[PDB]
Design a protein around this nucleic acid. Sequence first.
RNA 1: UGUAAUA
Length: 364
Amino acid sequence: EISALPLRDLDYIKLATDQFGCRFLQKKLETPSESNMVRDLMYEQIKPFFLDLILDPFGNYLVQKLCDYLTAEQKTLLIQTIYPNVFQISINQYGTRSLQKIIDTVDNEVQIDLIIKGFSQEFTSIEQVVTLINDLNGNHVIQKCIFKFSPSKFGFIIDAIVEQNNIITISTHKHGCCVLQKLLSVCTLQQIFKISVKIVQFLPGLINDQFGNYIIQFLLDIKELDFYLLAELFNRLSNELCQLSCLKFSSNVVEKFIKKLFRIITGFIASDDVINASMNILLTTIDIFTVNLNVLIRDNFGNYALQTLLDVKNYSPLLGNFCNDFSLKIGNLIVLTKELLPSIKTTSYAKKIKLKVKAYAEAT
RNA sequence: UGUAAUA
């Protein structure tokens, strides 16, 4: 029926929003002899409806398919048409597919810069950017930008994150937490810093959040942050370290934090200033865990923190002055655990603790 | 004995 019609006589808008018309057009695009011509005819007729098709249940398939065939000039004009609408497109079920494919097949920087302009405050508010980051459909467009574009383009993402308390809105959200991690994994160091300042400022709102705890831990894996983050975290948490060790989500961060102190000092046998404060903080921690040993060994979450501190496998090579202050105050904590060991017979993890006191002796 | 991620 439609196959018997000359391409020049096709009603491309009509076909584009139809499942079979759109599929017919796609197959025509995959047909080398007719690919170029069907593209150029289709293009001129559908260009006033670029936004419409991008959002269309079937049209979004055509737009995507077209991205593999459009000239640079054709794709540029397409982006010039719809860049102000990037918010609307990104939250859209079908629009998100179209935009990802467009972003994924940019030909040059002129096209990239247009998209970025769309995400700037001239067309998309900070609040809207935040919405996209947490949105079911939008977070995929943000991730696309994050993995396709140079970090020199990340301005609009950064601005939205550091705005007031948006670090909480983003970090404590199922989707935003993921995006932020993707961002941090590719960010420039100076961008990581700007976000880190905001994370530390709102640490209590993140440290024990179901998703926020993951952000803190992620930050702890970035080595270029050691020179300040270890002291910063601990100075903001020390007075409530026992509390945080006894909470579901923050207990993992304390464990992560403690293992990092061990890994840094052991590896010394990483820059020098870090080693200095790490030694100091570790000792203070043992003091804190010693004082509160009554609660930590008894807590449903705290015992994990304690066990991490006590595990000799973490600190074998530590067995100048510090290597003797540790051996004293951790050895002292070891014997103190023994005294309480009978007072927790009923618990499921007594034998796990008993093995650690046992493995202490074998290397002592 | 304890946490996440389109026909």
